[PDB]
Amino acid sequence: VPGFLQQSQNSGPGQPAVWHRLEELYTKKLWHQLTLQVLDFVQDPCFAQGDGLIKLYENFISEFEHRVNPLSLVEIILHVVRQMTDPNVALTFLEKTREKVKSSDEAVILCKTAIGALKLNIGDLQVTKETIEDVEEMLNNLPGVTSVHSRFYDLSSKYYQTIGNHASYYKDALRFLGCVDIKDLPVSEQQERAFTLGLAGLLGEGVFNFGELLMHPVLESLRNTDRQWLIDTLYAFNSGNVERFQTLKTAWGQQPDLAANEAQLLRKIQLLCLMEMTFTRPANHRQLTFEEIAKSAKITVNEVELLVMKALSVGLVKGSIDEVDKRVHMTWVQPRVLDLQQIKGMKDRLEFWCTDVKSMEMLVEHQAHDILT
Amino acid sequence: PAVDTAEQVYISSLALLKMLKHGRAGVPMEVMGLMLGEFVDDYTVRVIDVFAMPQSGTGVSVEAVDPVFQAKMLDMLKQTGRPEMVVGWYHSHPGFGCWLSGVDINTQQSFEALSERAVAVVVDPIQSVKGKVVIDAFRLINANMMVLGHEPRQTTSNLGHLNKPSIQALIHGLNRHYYSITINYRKNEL
Amino acid sequence: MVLESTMVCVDNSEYMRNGDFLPTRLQAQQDAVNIVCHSKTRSNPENNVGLITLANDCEVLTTLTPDTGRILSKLHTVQPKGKITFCTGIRVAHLALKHRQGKNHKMRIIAFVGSPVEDNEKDLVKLAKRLKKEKVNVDIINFGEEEVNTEKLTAFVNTLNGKDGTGSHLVTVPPGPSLADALISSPILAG
Amino acid sequence: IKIMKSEVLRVTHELQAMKDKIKENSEKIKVNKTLPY
Amino acid sequence: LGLPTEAYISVEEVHDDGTPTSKTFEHVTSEIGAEEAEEVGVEHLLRDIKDTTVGTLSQRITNQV
Ligand SMILES: [Zn+2]
């Protein structure tokens, strides 16, 4: 074994420093500093043309390890399979690495995420769903690791390149960004994640809440100069305003997935415009006239009726529609995100409410003093 | 000297609730348990706490007073911070009325052997109907004193206000062997 | 023959997952607790021993019980996937020792330091001063990879008891193949 | 030597304690039996 | 005022809307019920401040207050 590493000492910056350094830990029957060192040297920036050399050593270090952390082992085999780039035998390699550690240690889930990742390129539809399902059901009893969840949500985001994954991709991307907090990746990757999450939200048939536009740290902090319009558009989709100037602004860019869906985007804009316009109502004159809707959503007076019908049918409005006066009665079961000024105003309203309650309670106890007992 | 009719038993609210709950739970079978607390003085019996004991096939009797369970629970409650001493024993008489049978008499002298002022508490769970808690406290009088022209207990005061006892105790020989102790439940404001 | 309570502190951090000692440090430390508790209890059968783990938590899996069997029971399947927090380990050891059932047993602490200790110097010296003010004897023994003869640890044991005290030892182990024979020659026979 | 002593003491302790639990539970059962039926 | 008991359950989730995870204690509603023996015990234990269950005007007005 020492001769094997001596003859293959090359292919590393500072030929001794790359391999004999971890050999120094190896000779002293050590497997924790050694695994960290080999992890770091795998992450060392190289083509890793010596991968064919490391595997045997890895196999050697896998033949009588009996101490190495399975999580570090799978973290190294994912890089190994990324480097070797032979999907035909990769599947067997991951399967045998998974079977060689069958203990209760939760490293198998990472291997399942890896086989899903390398499997979402060839044969990505028939049984990859089974892989995702077994991963998610096995994802139980230990939510504090936060790495296996990250891998599962990475796989789910990988699945986004399908016909019917827009809102679900948005939810899983939210879960991923919740799992990993700090930067720990280039600004380009983070802004790409925020961008894809944004287009998922705009195209999400089942999502219109957009409560994380100004609440999610990633997209709010990112994208100040590089195609920043997205956050602005998100603001529009939370402001309900016309702002179709911004819609065309993002129409010049991102021509695919938006030029073909401009119609659905306009319908979504109109629905959120209805939501905003009856949110701005003073809560006493909740009735909405036809002309204000027509002039706000810049739609004909014969379409407001069907628009509010669609909004009520979806489950965001619980009002009613009149026609002789054509005033749409309004009641709400679909809340929204607040803001500092809105919170201040609404807590002032609550203070008024509590003052009225206290005044009537005082009057009641004063008038009913004798009967009280 | 002779005990006084002014003597009364202070039962904490928790103790009373525990005894009634155990009596209902063990119905129709008769249960029993120790009565932790402190005598404090001659005229008071403070029942701070009561803990149930496992039910044995012999029923309420001395062989069902397994010392392993009692000793372990006593020392370990004192470890928690409850260092009381046994002041008596409660037991259940469902549908019988508050009185002592012969076996209860043997258990009561066995209890008086180590603690002279032990108290036997009888609770009727089924008879403890809403708004009526049938509970009584007794202590044995040996035949030697009462036969020898001596009153079983001196009435130094007017605390003998305890009304005419239920005739069931009279048929079961209340005053012949076990003088009843007037009851006084102690309730804190919390 | 001296009445005492032994409050052992074992380690199950990830740093016990390299074969520096024996097959691995887990069985080395298990046999170490075995022999030390054996010596303590055959020295006096009226004593009692317990164990606290230290990896990212501090569990009291076995309280202060005379029967060593429970300590041997919970020493098993320790699953070394944690991180050592020595600052709270000795604190919880003393806080469990103050729950002593007998009021005549003497203080005695054994802690299994197998990982480097990430503690402030002021924090450890004030811990030692508090131990002085509360009259608790602590013996620290070091295994595995570790900065040999820690200045913080040697100061901690020096100010644990000063000015001609009993002499609570700071025991280090020779790296490589070595049992606790050195750990029983000096420390076990005399404290 | 590790496996033999380790698991021998393990299963011996578990068997002894569990047999003690057997004996206590059985004794309580029989003392609950009594008579008559 | 009332309800001296607050029941809390530990939950563990990704917090759905992308927030850092923590333990957190989700609240579960609680109420004070009683068993028949405990019911008679407590009613006899009070026996001096228990209000009439029929209510009547004074106690309904105090309930409103
Ligand atoms: Zn009886």
Determine which helix (DSSP H) or strand (DSSP E) holds A66, and give its type and residue range. none
E12 contacts chain A (CB < 8 A):
yes
Task: Name the residue with tokens 């014969």.
Answer: A302
Alpha-carbon gap, residue D2 to C18, rounded angstroms: 17
Q: Return the residue of A nearest to C22 by Cα.
A: A29
CA–CA–CA angle D10, D13, D19 (5° rounding): 135
How would you class A76 by CB atoms within 10 Å of its CB: exposed for 0-12, middle for 13-18, buried for 19 or more?
Answer: buried
* Helix or strand holding residue B123 (H, E): strand B119-123
Query: Is B45's Cβ below 8 Å from some Cβ in E?
Result: no
CB contact under 8 A, E41 and B20: yes
Q: Which chain B residue has its CA at the smallest distance from D37's CA?
A: B57
Helix runs in E1-65, H state only: 36-46, 56-64
DSSP per residue, A4-19: HHHHT--SSSSHHHHH
**Chain centroid, CA E4 distance in Å:** 6
Is C72 in Cβ contact with D13 (below 8 Å)?
A: yes
CA C71/CA C37 separation, integer angstroms: 9
CB A301 within 8 A of CB A308: no
Q: How far apart are CA B75 and CA E40, in angstroms?
A: 32
Cβ contacts of C19 on chain A, cutoff 8 Å: 29-31, 66-67
C-alpha distance from residue C107 to each of A81, C49, C165, C189 (Å):
56, 11, 14, 16
- Separation of B94 CA from ligand 1 center, angstroms? 10
| Burial zone of C168 (CB within 10 Å; 0-12 exposed, 13-18 middle, 19+ buried) | buried
Q: Are strands B8-12 and B178-186 parallel, antiparallel or unpaired?
A: parallel
Q: What is the largest CA-CA distance in chain E?
A: 56
Determine, for residues D13 and C76 on separate chains, whether the beta-carbon distance falls below 8 Å: no
Q: How far is the CA of A28 from the centre of ligand 1 (A)?
A: 76
Which residue ranges of B make up the annotated binding site for Zn(2+)? Answer: 91, 93, 104
Least Cα distance to C66 among C31, C96, C38, C104 occurs for C38
190-229 in chain A: CB under 8 A from chain E? 211-212, 215-216, 218
Give the 3-state secondary structure of residue B162.
Answer: coil
Residues A144 and E9: beta-carbon distance below 8 Å: no
A59 touches A76 (CB < 8 A):
no
Cα-Cα-Cα-Cα dihedral sign, residues A161, A167, A170, A175 = negative
Q: How many CA atoms lie within 13 A of B64 on its CB side?
A: 25
Partner-chain contact C27 D10, CB within 8 Å: no
Question: Residue B131 is nearest to which of E36, E38, E43, comparing CB atoms?
Answer: E43
User: What is the stated resolution of the deposited model, in angstroms?
Assistant: 3.1
Query: Inter-chain contact C76–D9, Cβ cutoff 8 Å?
Result: no
Q: From the CA of B102, how far away is ligand 1's center (Å)?
A: 8
Contact check, Cβ <8 Å, A211/E61: no
| Whole-Å CA distances, C176 to A1, A174, C21, C28 | 21, 50, 6, 12
CA pair distance D29, A106, nearest whole angstrom: 44
C145/A31 Cβ within 8 A: no
Q: Dump the DSSP string for chain C.
A: ---EEEEEE---BGGG-STTSSS-HHHHHHHHHHHHHHHHHHH-TT-EEEEE--BSS---SEEEES-HHHHHHHHSS----B-B-HHHHHHHHHHHHTT-S-SSPEEEEEEEE-S-----HHHHHHHHHHHHHHT--EEEEE-SS--SS-HHHHHHHHHHS-SS-----EEE--SSS--THHHHHTTTT--
Closest-CA residue of chain A to C81:
A69
- Give the long-range contacts of residues A142-146, CB within 8 A, separation 24 or more: A142/A106, A143/E12, A143/E13, A143/E14, A143/E21, A144/E12, A144/E21, A145/A106, A146/A179, A146/A180, A146/E21
Query: CB distance from C67 to chain D under 8 Å?
Result: no
Q: Which residues contact B38 (CB under 8 A, 6 or more apart)?
A: B46, B48, B84, B85, B87
Cα A159 to ligand 1 centre (Å): 75
- The residue of chain A nearest to residue E57, with distances taken between CA atoms, is A371
Query: A270 C-alpha to center of ligand 1: Å?
Result: 82
User: Shortest CA distance to A202 belongs to which of A122, A257, A138?
Assistant: A257
Contact C84, C43 (CB under 8 A): no
Residues 6 or more apart in contact with residue A338 via CB below 8 angstroms: A346
SS3 of residue E26 by DSSP:
strand
Which DSSP symbol is given to A49?
T
Q: What one-character DSSP code corresponds to residue A264? A: H
B91, B31 in Cβ contact below 8 A? yes
Sequence ranges of the binding site of B: 91, 93, 104
Enumerate residues preceding breaks in chain D (C to N > 2.5 Å).
Answer: none
Contact at 8 Å (CB) between A334 and A317? yes
DSSP-assigned states of every residue in A205-240: TT----TTTTT-HHHHHS-SSTTTHHHHHHHHHHH-
Cβ–Cβ under 8 Å, residues A86 and A94: no
Amino acid at B26: G
- Across the interface, of C23, C30, C69, the residue whose CB is closest to D13 is C69
What Cα–Cα distance (Å) separates residue C71 from each residue in C34, C117, C179?
9, 24, 20
**Pairwise CA distance, residues C103 & A224, whole Å:** 69
CB A338 within 8 A of CB A215: no
Question: Is B128's Cβ below 8 Å from some Cβ in E?
Answer: yes
Tokens of B176: 């012949």
**If we measure between CA atoms, which residue out of A121, A180, A191, A194 comes closest to residue A152?**
A180
Which single residue is written with the structure tokens 């003093």? A369
Are the Cβ atoms of C18 and A29 closer than 8 angstroms?
Answer: yes
Tokens encoding B127? 């008879």
Pair A11, A49: CB distance under 8 Å: yes
Nearest 5°: the CA angle D7, D10, D16 is: 135
Task: Tell me which residue of B32, B53, B42 sits closest to B121, measured CA to CA.
Answer: B32
HSE on the CB side for A295, CA within 13 Å? 5
Give the dihedral sign, CA B68/B71/B77/B78: negative
Q: How far apart are CA A259 and CA A265, in angstroms?
A: 10
Structure tokens at D17: 């304690």
Distance CA A314, CA C154 (A): 71
* Residue spans of alpha helices (H) in chain A: 2-7, 15-27, 33-43, 51-63, 70-84, 87-100, 108-119, 128-138, 148-158, 167-179, 187-203, 217-221, 229-239, 244-252, 262-279, 290-296, 304-314, 340-367, 369-372
Q: How far is A162 from chain E (nearest CA, A)?
A: 22
Q: In the numeric block, which tokens belong to residue A72?
A: 């570090």
In the DSSP assignment, the letter for residue A184 is -
As given in the structure block, the two tokens for residue B112 are 């008086």
Segment holding B145, helix H or strand E: helix B143-147
Q: What one-letter code names the amino acid at A214?
A: L
The CA–CA distances, whole Å, from C166 to A164, B14, B148, C108, C189 equal 75, 50, 70, 12, 13
Task: Find out whether C169 and C139 touch, Cβ atoms under 8 Å.
Answer: yes
Q: E19 touching A, CB under 8 A?
A: yes
Task: Answer yes or no: do A177 and E18 touch at CB < 8 A.
Answer: yes
Angle between helices A33-43 and A15-27 in degrees, nearest 10: 160
CA distance A170 to A113: 19
What spacing in Å lies between the alpha carbon of B115 and ligand 1's midpoint?
19
Q: Other C-beta atoms within 10 Å of A102: how many?
A: 8
Of A33, A67, A69, which is closest to C19 when you measure between CB atoms? A67
